[PDB]
Protein backbone atom coordinates (compact mmCIF):
# COMPACT_ATOMS: atom_id res chain seq x y z
CA UNK A 1 0.00 0.00 0.00
CA UNK A 2 2.88 2.39 0.75
CA UNK A 3 4.39 1.98 -2.74
CA UNK A 4 7.93 2.64 -1.55
CA UNK A 5 10.28 3.93 -4.22
CA UNK A 6 12.81 6.61 -5.10
CA UNK A 7 12.73 8.79 -8.22
CA UNK A 8 12.54 12.36 -9.40
CA UNK A 9 13.97 15.42 -7.70
CA UNK A 10 16.63 14.90 -5.05
CA UNK A 11 15.35 17.63 -2.68
CA UNK A 12 11.87 18.48 -1.43
CA UNK A 13 11.31 21.81 0.32
CA UNK A 14 8.55 20.92 2.78
CA UNK A 15 6.46 23.25 4.93
CA UNK A 16 6.80 22.81 8.69
CA UNK A 17 5.45 24.92 11.55
CA UNK A 18 7.79 26.22 14.27
CA UNK A 19 6.33 27.22 17.63
CA UNK A 20 6.27 30.98 18.17
CA UNK A 21 6.55 31.77 14.43
CA UNK A 22 3.30 32.51 12.61
CA UNK A 23 4.93 31.74 9.26
CA UNK A 24 5.53 28.17 8.18
CA UNK A 25 9.26 27.43 8.35
CA UNK A 26 10.55 25.71 5.22
CA UNK A 27 13.03 22.86 5.71
CA UNK A 28 15.13 21.05 3.12
CA UNK A 29 15.20 17.25 3.02
CA UNK A 30 16.67 14.71 0.65
CA UNK A 31 13.97 12.94 -1.37
CA UNK A 32 14.83 9.56 0.14
CA UNK A 33 12.29 8.68 2.78
CA UNK A 34 13.40 6.91 5.98
CA UNK A 35 10.91 4.15 5.17
CA UNK A 36 13.11 3.20 2.21
CA UNK A 37 16.11 2.85 4.53
CA UNK A 38 14.02 0.71 6.86
CA UNK A 39 12.92 -1.36 3.87
CA UNK A 40 16.45 -2.42 2.95
CA UNK A 41 17.06 -3.81 6.43
CA UNK A 42 13.57 -5.32 6.56
CA UNK A 43 13.94 -7.40 3.40
CA UNK A 44 17.41 -8.59 4.33
CA UNK A 45 16.42 -9.62 7.85
CA UNK A 46 13.21 -11.45 6.96
CA UNK A 47 14.96 -13.61 4.35
CA UNK A 48 17.40 -15.20 6.79
CA UNK A 49 14.52 -15.73 9.22
CA UNK A 50 12.97 -17.93 6.50
CA UNK A 51 10.08 -15.69 5.45
CA UNK A 52 9.47 -15.72 1.69
CA UNK A 53 9.46 -11.98 1.04
CA UNK A 54 7.35 -11.12 -2.04
CA UNK A 55 9.56 -10.61 -5.06
CA UNK A 56 7.87 -7.28 -5.81
CA UNK A 57 9.17 -5.77 -2.57
CA UNK A 58 12.65 -7.20 -3.18
CA UNK A 59 12.70 -5.32 -6.48
CA UNK A 60 11.59 -2.08 -4.82
CA UNK A 61 14.04 -2.46 -1.93
CA UNK A 62 16.90 -3.56 -4.19
CA UNK A 63 16.34 -0.64 -6.56
CA UNK A 64 16.67 2.00 -3.86
CA UNK A 65 19.60 0.29 -2.14
CA UNK A 66 21.62 1.00 -5.28
CA UNK A 67 20.98 4.70 -4.58
CA UNK A 68 21.59 4.41 -0.83
CA UNK A 69 25.29 5.51 -0.90
CA UNK A 70 24.36 8.81 -2.52
CA UNK A 71 21.33 9.23 -0.28
CA UNK A 72 23.20 8.97 3.02
CA UNK A 73 25.85 11.41 1.82
CA UNK A 74 23.23 14.03 1.02
CA UNK A 75 21.21 13.47 4.19
CA UNK A 76 24.16 14.26 6.44
CA UNK A 77 25.47 16.89 4.04
CA UNK A 78 22.07 18.57 4.14
CA UNK A 79 21.83 18.12 7.91
CA UNK A 80 25.29 19.62 8.32
CA UNK A 81 24.12 22.70 6.42
CA UNK A 82 21.20 23.17 8.80
CA UNK A 83 23.25 22.97 11.99
CA UNK A 84 26.10 25.10 10.68
CA UNK A 85 23.53 27.73 9.70
CA UNK A 86 21.99 27.36 13.16
CA UNK A 87 25.34 28.17 14.76
CA UNK A 88 25.68 31.31 12.64
CA UNK A 89 22.23 32.53 13.66
CA UNK A 90 23.19 32.13 17.32
CA UNK A 91 26.00 34.70 16.97
CA UNK A 92 24.96 37.67 14.85
CA UNK A 93 28.48 39.14 15.14
CA UNK A 94 30.02 36.54 12.80
CA UNK A 95 27.17 36.78 10.29
CA UNK A 96 29.07 38.99 7.86
CA UNK A 97 32.22 36.87 7.74
CA UNK A 98 30.48 33.67 6.57
CA UNK A 99 28.61 35.56 3.86
CA UNK A 100 31.04 34.37 1.21
CA UNK A 101 30.87 30.71 2.19
CA UNK A 102 27.10 30.64 2.67
CA UNK A 103 26.79 32.02 -0.87
CA UNK A 104 28.56 29.01 -2.36
CA UNK A 105 26.54 26.42 -0.45
CA UNK A 106 23.32 28.13 -1.51
CA UNK A 107 24.67 27.93 -5.06
CA UNK A 108 25.47 24.22 -4.79
CA UNK A 109 22.10 23.52 -3.18
CA UNK A 110 20.57 25.64 -5.92
CA UNK A 111 22.25 23.35 -8.44
CA UNK A 112 20.91 20.21 -6.78
CA UNK A 113 17.26 21.24 -6.87
CA UNK A 114 17.33 20.86 -10.67
CA UNK A 115 18.78 17.34 -10.67
CA UNK A 116 16.94 14.01 -10.59
CA UNK A 117 18.13 10.74 -9.11
CA UNK A 118 18.87 9.24 -12.53
CA UNK A 119 21.28 12.02 -13.51
CA UNK A 120 24.82 10.91 -14.23
CA UNK A 121 25.90 14.21 -12.66
CA UNK A 122 24.73 12.90 -9.27
CA UNK A 123 28.12 11.21 -8.83
CA UNK A 124 30.31 14.36 -8.93
CA UNK A 125 27.54 16.41 -7.31
CA UNK A 126 27.29 14.38 -4.10
CA UNK A 127 31.03 14.69 -3.51
CA UNK A 128 30.92 18.42 -4.22
CA UNK A 129 28.01 19.11 -1.88
CA UNK A 130 29.48 16.85 0.79
CA UNK A 131 32.90 18.46 0.54
CA UNK A 132 31.76 22.09 0.43
CA UNK A 133 29.36 21.75 3.36
CA UNK A 134 32.21 20.20 5.33
CA UNK A 135 34.30 23.25 4.45
CA UNK A 136 31.44 25.55 5.49
CA UNK A 137 31.10 23.75 8.88
CA UNK A 138 34.88 23.71 9.56
CA UNK A 139 35.34 27.45 8.79
CA UNK A 140 32.27 28.46 10.91
CA UNK A 141 33.52 26.33 13.86
CA UNK A 142 36.96 28.02 13.61
CA UNK A 143 35.28 31.48 13.42
CA UNK A 144 33.28 30.85 16.65
CA UNK A 145 36.65 30.06 18.36
CA UNK A 146 38.55 32.95 16.61
CA UNK A 147 35.93 35.61 17.51
CA UNK A 148 35.62 34.37 21.10
CA UNK A 149 39.35 35.07 21.36
CA UNK A 150 38.90 38.54 19.88
CA UNK A 151 35.91 39.15 22.15
CA UNK A 152 37.83 38.08 25.25
CA UNK A 153 40.72 40.37 24.32
CA UNK A 154 38.63 43.45 23.55
CA UNK A 155 36.91 43.07 26.93
CA UNK A 156 40.39 42.69 28.44
CA UNK A 157 41.23 46.25 27.37
CA UNK A 158 38.69 47.58 29.87
CA UNK A 159 40.38 45.90 32.86
CA UNK A 160 44.12 45.86 32.13
CA UNK A 161 46.90 47.83 33.77
CA UNK A 162 47.32 51.30 32.28
CA UNK A 163 50.75 50.66 30.81
CA UNK A 164 51.65 50.92 27.14
CA UNK A 165 53.19 47.46 26.79
CA UNK A 166 50.15 45.72 28.27
CA UNK A 167 47.87 47.62 25.89
CA UNK A 168 50.15 46.79 22.97
CA UNK A 169 50.22 43.11 23.93
CA UNK A 170 46.42 42.86 23.87
CA UNK A 171 46.15 44.57 20.48
CA UNK A 172 49.03 42.44 19.21
CA UNK A 173 47.02 39.32 20.03
CA UNK A 174 43.89 40.82 18.48
CA UNK A 175 45.89 41.70 15.35
CA UNK A 176 47.15 38.08 14.92
CA UNK A 177 43.54 36.75 15.06
CA UNK A 178 42.47 39.27 12.35
CA UNK A 179 45.49 38.17 10.22
CA UNK A 180 44.38 34.48 10.36
CA UNK A 181 40.84 35.59 9.30
CA UNK A 182 42.47 37.44 6.35
CA UNK A 183 44.23 34.20 5.25
CA UNK A 184 41.03 32.08 5.36
CA UNK A 185 39.39 34.76 3.11
CA UNK A 186 36.17 35.19 5.10
CA UNK A 187 34.33 37.84 3.12
CA UNK A 188 33.43 41.34 4.33
CA UNK A 189 36.50 41.38 6.57
CA UNK A 190 37.15 45.13 6.04
CA UNK A 191 33.59 45.96 7.07
CA UNK A 192 33.75 43.74 10.15
CA UNK A 193 37.14 44.94 11.40
CA UNK A 194 36.00 48.55 11.14
CA UNK A 195 33.20 47.74 13.57
CA UNK A 196 35.81 46.09 15.79
CA UNK A 197 38.03 49.16 15.44
CA UNK A 198 35.32 51.54 16.65
CA UNK A 199 34.56 49.37 19.67
CA UNK A 200 38.28 49.23 20.45
CA UNK A 201 38.41 53.01 20.01
CA UNK A 202 35.53 53.45 22.46
CA UNK A 203 37.21 51.28 25.08
CA UNK A 204 40.52 53.07 24.65
CA UNK A 205 38.70 56.40 24.80
CA UNK A 206 37.07 55.40 28.08
CA UNK A 207 40.40 54.19 29.47
CA UNK A 208 42.03 57.44 28.37
CA UNK A 209 39.48 59.37 30.44
CA UNK A 210 40.53 57.47 33.55
CA UNK A 211 44.14 58.04 32.56
CA UNK A 212 43.77 61.82 32.42
CA UNK A 213 41.78 62.18 35.64
CA UNK A 214 44.21 59.88 37.45
CA UNK A 215 47.03 61.97 35.99
CA UNK A 216 45.20 65.12 37.06
CA UNK A 217 44.80 63.84 40.63
CA UNK A 218 48.51 63.10 41.05
CA UNK A 219 49.35 66.57 39.72
CA UNK A 220 47.08 68.17 42.34
CA UNK A 221 41.23 52.13 35.97
CA UNK A 222 43.35 55.25 35.53
CA UNK A 223 46.68 53.62 36.35
CA UNK A 224 49.34 54.91 38.75
CA UNK A 225 50.75 58.12 37.23
CA UNK A 226 64.78 76.68 35.25
CA UNK A 227 62.35 79.51 34.38
CA UNK A 228 58.59 79.36 34.93
CA UNK A 229 57.98 78.40 31.29
CA UNK A 230 60.15 75.29 31.61
CA UNK A 231 57.90 74.07 34.44
CA UNK A 232 54.90 74.39 32.13
CA UNK A 233 56.80 72.61 29.35
CA UNK A 234 57.88 69.80 31.68
CA UNK A 235 54.33 69.25 32.95
CA UNK A 236 52.87 69.10 29.44
CA UNK A 237 55.77 66.89 28.34
CA UNK A 238 54.89 64.52 31.18
CA UNK A 239 51.22 64.65 30.19
CA UNK A 240 52.10 63.84 26.59
CA UNK A 241 54.00 60.84 27.93
CA UNK A 242 50.77 59.79 29.65
CA UNK A 243 48.57 60.69 26.69
CA UNK A 244 50.77 58.73 24.28
CA UNK A 245 50.22 55.57 26.35
CA UNK A 246 46.91 55.08 24.52
CA UNK A 247 47.10 57.36 21.48
CA UNK A 248 50.38 55.78 20.31
CA UNK A 249 48.95 52.26 20.23
CA UNK A 250 48.81 50.59 16.80
CA UNK A 251 45.50 50.54 14.96
CA UNK A 252 43.97 47.18 14.08
CA UNK A 253 44.37 46.51 10.36
CA UNK A 254 42.18 44.16 8.34
CA UNK A 255 44.40 43.73 5.25
CA UNK A 256 47.86 43.19 6.72
CA UNK A 257 48.50 40.50 4.11
CA UNK A 258 47.55 42.50 0.99
CA UNK A 259 51.18 43.50 0.65
CA UNK A 260 52.50 45.09 -2.50
CA UNK A 261 48.97 46.40 -3.09
CA UNK A 262 49.91 50.03 -2.51
CA UNK A 263 47.50 52.22 -0.57
CA UNK A 264 49.18 54.82 1.63
CA UNK A 265 48.15 54.77 5.30
CA UNK A 266 48.10 58.11 7.09
CA UNK A 267 49.02 58.71 10.73
CA UNK A 268 45.33 58.65 11.67
CA UNK A 269 44.86 55.20 10.15
CA UNK A 270 48.04 53.83 11.73
CA UNK A 271 47.30 54.79 15.35
CA UNK A 272 44.39 55.73 17.61
CA UNK A 273 45.13 59.44 17.54
CA UNK A 274 41.38 60.06 17.20
CA UNK A 275 40.64 58.15 20.42
CA UNK A 276 41.07 61.40 22.37
CA UNK A 277 37.81 62.56 20.76
CA UNK A 278 35.97 59.41 21.95
CA UNK A 279 36.05 60.18 25.68
CA UNK A 280 32.61 59.44 27.19
CA UNK A 281 32.42 62.72 29.12
CA UNK A 282 33.29 64.87 26.11
CA UNK A 283 36.42 67.04 26.23
CA UNK A 284 35.79 67.86 29.92
CA UNK A 285 38.46 65.50 31.27
CA UNK A 286 41.07 66.93 28.90
CA UNK A 287 40.30 70.45 30.13
CA UNK A 288 40.83 69.38 33.74
CA UNK A 289 44.25 68.01 32.79
CA UNK A 290 45.24 71.28 31.13
CA UNK A 291 43.61 73.33 33.90
CA UNK A 292 45.53 71.48 36.61
CA UNK A 293 48.78 72.25 34.79
CA UNK A 294 47.67 75.89 34.70
CA UNK A 295 46.82 75.84 38.40
CA UNK A 296 50.22 74.58 39.55
CA UNK A 297 52.03 77.01 37.24
CA UNK A 298 49.88 79.87 38.53
CA UNK A 299 50.88 79.12 42.13
CA UNK A 300 54.59 78.70 41.36
CA UNK A 301 54.63 81.92 39.33
Amino acid sequence: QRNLGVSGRIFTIESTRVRGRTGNVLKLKVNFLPEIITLSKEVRNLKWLGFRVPLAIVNKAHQANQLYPFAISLIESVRTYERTCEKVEERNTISLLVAGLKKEVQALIAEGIALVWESYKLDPYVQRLAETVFNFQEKVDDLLIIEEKIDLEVRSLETCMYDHKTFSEILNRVQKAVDDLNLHSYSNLPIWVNKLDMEIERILGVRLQAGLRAWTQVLLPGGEPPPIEECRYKLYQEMFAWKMVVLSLPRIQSQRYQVGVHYELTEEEKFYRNALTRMPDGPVALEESYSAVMGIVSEVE
Binding site: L26, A99, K103
Partner: peptide
Protein backbone atom coordinates in the same frame (compact mmCIF):
# COMPACT_ATOMS: atom_id res chain seq x y z
CA UNK B 1 28.50 44.26 1.51
CA UNK B 2 27.74 40.90 -0.10
CA UNK B 3 25.06 39.28 2.06
CA UNK B 4 23.84 35.70 2.01
CA UNK B 5 20.10 35.36 1.56
CA UNK B 6 18.12 34.35 4.62
CA UNK B 7 17.22 30.67 4.70
CA UNK B 8 13.48 31.35 4.63
CA UNK B 9 13.51 33.68 1.62
CA UNK B 10 16.02 31.43 -0.15
CA UNK B 11 13.85 28.36 0.36
CA UNK B 12 10.77 30.30 -0.75
CA UNK B 13 12.61 31.25 -3.94
CA UNK B 14 13.69 27.66 -4.49
CA UNK B 15 10.11 26.48 -3.95
CA UNK B 16 8.95 29.00 -6.56
CA UNK B 17 11.58 27.69 -8.97
CA UNK B 18 10.68 24.06 -8.28
CA UNK B 19 6.89 24.33 -8.54
CA UNK B 20 6.92 26.29 -11.81
CA UNK B 21 9.23 23.72 -13.45
Amino acid sequence: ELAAEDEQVFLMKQQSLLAKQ
